[PDB]
Structure formats: C-alpha cells, structure tokens
Design a protein around this ligand. Structure first.
Ligand SMILES: NCCc1c[nH]c2ccc(O)cc12
Length: 256
C-alpha cells in the first residue's frame, strides 16, 4: 500500500533530522531549534494520527477504535497540522525580516527570538484547536458523520480553515512576494536562495492547498468525500517532505 511507506518515511526522516541537530555541534542556533520543533510536530503527527488514518483506510472508513477516542484524534490532527502550518508561516516571516534588513535582524537575534517564536506558534496551535476536545467527548454528534470520524460542525470548519490556513496563506504570499522583491558575487547566492524559496513555497501550496479548498467548498456546497479521502494523505505527505526541503539545502545535514 502507498500509505505504508509514508509512515516509515516520516518516522525515519524526522528522527534523522533531530539526531543530526543533536549530534552536529555546528547546527546549534535559533533557526535550527525552530526546525527541530517543526520536526517534533511532524513526528508526533506521523506517530499518532497517521497509522490511525491508515487503519481507517484499511477498514473502509468504518472506524474500529471506540467512540470515546474520536474527539482526541481530530484534536491531535488539527493541533499538529496547525502547528506545522504556523511553523512554516513563522519561518517565512523570519526569513523576510532576516533578508530585508539583515543588520537590524541580527541586532535582535537572541535565543529569546526562537523561544518566543516556538511559544507563539504552539500557543496559537493550542488555542485554535480549543473547541475540539471539550465539545466532542460528550457531544458525539458534532464529531461524527454517518458512523465515521469527521468534523460535522461546519461552523467550526469554515472559521478554523480561515484562521488556520487562509490567513497564513495570505501572510506567506505577501512575505514571499516581498522577499523575492528584496532579493532583486552575492548575486549568485541570491539565485540559489530564490530557487529554494520558490520550491519551498510552491511545494507548501501544492501539498496543503487542495485539501483546504475542497474542505471549504464542502461546507459552501460523494465526489467531495472521495477527493477529501486522498487530499488528507496528500496533506500528510507535506510532513515527510518538510524535513527534506528545509535541511538538504545545507550540506551539514547531508554530511550527518
Ligand atoms: N486534518 C486536519 C487538518 C486541519 C488543520 N487545521 C484545520 C482547521 C480546520 C479543519 O476543519 C481542519 C484542519
């Protein structure tokens, strides 16, 4: 099965990134600490929610696990996915600040920057996902649809997509545009930086954007469910690629 390789690839890659950060002394910085937090978020995703989704696939969407654990699976999924998305948004904003005015960024670049960034993205990821477990454990009608775990509460779905993906999308489009506008023998390295930024941004858009577009179009409107069933796993594929496209541009990670 195609989903059998994705769990192993995610669990291997994130362990490799965290072991390379812990072992290589040259990779101790604020940005690499934020990247280790990103790898922690996707490793928790690939360990906790991804074989559960494979189990849901192997039973034909009739959920084998009992009904008490549905509201925490949506909680873990939304929490780790919002953590990953806000991690990429904060990385894009920090790259724009560190590329537009490099003197004033390095003037304020303490480890308090990294700790406040991690605190902000995890606080946001907790606070956006807050109505999931309190309103789902006793109220099974809002987190079930025809005997399967799904977010039936579309009033949560529309607003949560709006705060979780589309406002990060409208932030990262602006910061990517202004970072390309600010990158226009350093001229040779700026082209490699532009290529890496383009690959990372368009890969994020391609990996996450079909699922949220069809998720909002589900609430605006069985083809939609069959599209969602594979676009979720396309969304899970971002968490295995995000260690690769954020580390392999630096040769120290490849030498590790
Ligand atoms: N697999 C859940 C993906 C996800 C991340 N953030 C979300 C916000 C709302 C929602 O319906 C879904 C999500």
């Amino acid at each position: 099965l195609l989903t059998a390789v994705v769990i192993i690839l995610t669990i291997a890659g994130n362990i490799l990134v965290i072991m390379a950060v812990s072992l290589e002394k040259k990779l101790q910085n604020a940005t690499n600490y934020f990247l280790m937090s990103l790898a922690i978020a996707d490793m928790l995703l690939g360990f906790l929610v991804m074989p559960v989704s494979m189990l849901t696939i192997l039973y034909g969407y009739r959920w084998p696990l009992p009904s008490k654990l549905c509201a925490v699976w949506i909680y873990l999924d939304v929490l780790f996915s919002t953590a990953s998305i806000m991690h990429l948004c904060a990385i894009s904003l920090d790259r724009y600040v560190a590329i537009q005015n490099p003197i004033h960024h390095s003037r304020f670049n303490s480890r308090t920057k990294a700790f406040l960034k991690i605190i902000a993205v995890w606080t946001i990821s907790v606070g956006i996902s807050m109505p999931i477990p309190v309103f789902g454990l006793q109220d099974d009608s809002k987190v079930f649809k025809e005997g399967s775990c799904l977010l039936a509460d579309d009033n949560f779905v529309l607003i949560g997509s709006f705060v979780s993906f589309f406002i990060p999308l409208t932030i990262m489009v602006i910061t990517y545009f202004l970072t390309i506008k600010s990158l226009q023998q350093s001229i040779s390295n700026e082209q490699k930086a532009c290529k890496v930024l383009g690959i990372v941004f368009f890969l994020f858009v391609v990996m996450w954007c079909p699922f949220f577009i069809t998720n909002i179009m589900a609430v605006i409107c069985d083809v939609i469910g069959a599209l969602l069933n594979v676009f979720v796993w396309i969304g899970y594929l971002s968490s295995a690629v995000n260690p690769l496209v954020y580390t392999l541009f630096n040769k120290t990670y490849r030498s590790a």
